[PDB]
Amino acid sequence: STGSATTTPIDSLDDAYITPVQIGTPAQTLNLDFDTGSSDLWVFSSETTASEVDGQTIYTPSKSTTAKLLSGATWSISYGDGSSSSGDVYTDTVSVGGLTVTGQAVESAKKVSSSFTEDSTIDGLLGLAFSTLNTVSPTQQKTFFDNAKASLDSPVFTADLGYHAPGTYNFGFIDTTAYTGSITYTAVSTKQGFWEWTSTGYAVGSGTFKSTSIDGIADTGTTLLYLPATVVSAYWAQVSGAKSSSSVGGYVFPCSATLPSFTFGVGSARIVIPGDYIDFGPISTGSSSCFGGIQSSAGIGINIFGDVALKAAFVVFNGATTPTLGFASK
Secondary structure, eight states, X not given: OOEEEEEEESXXXXXXXXXXXXXTTTTEEEEEEEETTOOOEEEOBTTSOGGGXXXXXXXXXXXXXXXXXXXXXXXXXXXXXXXXXXXEEEEEEEEETTEEEEEEEEEEEEEEOHHHHTOTTOOEEXXXXXXXXXXXXXXXXXXXXXXXXXXXXXXXXXXXXXXXXXXXXXXXOOXXXXXXXXXXXXXXXXXXXXXXXXXEEEEETTSOOEEEEEEEEEOTTOOSEEEOHHHHHHHHTTSTTOEEETTTTEEEEETTOOOOOXXXXXXXXXXXXXXXXXXXXXXXXTOSEEEXXXXXXXXXXXXXXXXXXXXXXXXXXXXXXXXXXXXXXX
16 A cells, blocks of 8 residues: 655745644644654543643544544653644544544543743644654553555655745655755654654855764654754854854844755755755744754754755655655655
8 A cells, every 4th residue: 555645835935834634534634744853642632621722623532433532541642843732532433535544542642841832733643753763651652654564565755845835754755856966864763752864964055075983863743954063053054144043042144144055964965955945034023033943952962854855855765574664855
């Protein structure tokens, strides 16, 4: 089997992407944030504290003839941005882009933190990291991809995120029309539960390529590119007036600037992020200070190849017995 679904930016900055997901019988379609940095499929629901729902579409398990309470199971998750959610668990039928999994754990939120409430466009998350990170207790549950894998034509999914435009998540096949050149594959460590890999270096604009190993994660659920402070300083030093602002929370730059590109290495291959992809717009409405799309990871503990980086590539998440990542230009 295969599936193919369009993923759409939630706003004009590509802050996140939403993909429609069918849950239950008859189908209830919710727009979920596909997140290769976590491993829980959770949704706003009829159980979510009413004051914490503000415009999201909810899953109502009592209206699904295939929903079953997973008795005794609870979940609770905290994300790198400080947001969180928790609740109980149902199993139900879940379909993405024509690919159907029966018995998928659908984690129903009883509580969500304010950033989720405040984002009316995201009805929940669909985790695509390794199932060892799933938070369901006392019986850990599998991701949608893990449950689908054995049925797929090939044990892969691909992320093809658009810049200010829709893109595609495919399951079970690699669309050879969706990229240019060849796909370069690179090793993955699953030791932390992430799609963790090592970039071979970087370049700023037209500058020379610096060969240096940068371990980090391919994370569709993180907006920006978070890299070591040395690398990030070298980038922003090429932008007149750019500076790190403790009060804003990262590098800002004059909105009048033209940003240089940023290249990252995948083996001997190179992925070029155009300068425009690094512009996240005014820090507040009407400001002439703009927020940068490349930020330091120094306070995170891990480097994160988020959407800014991934949207410049066609990315293969290869879930074969030894997982690997593939990157192609497009």
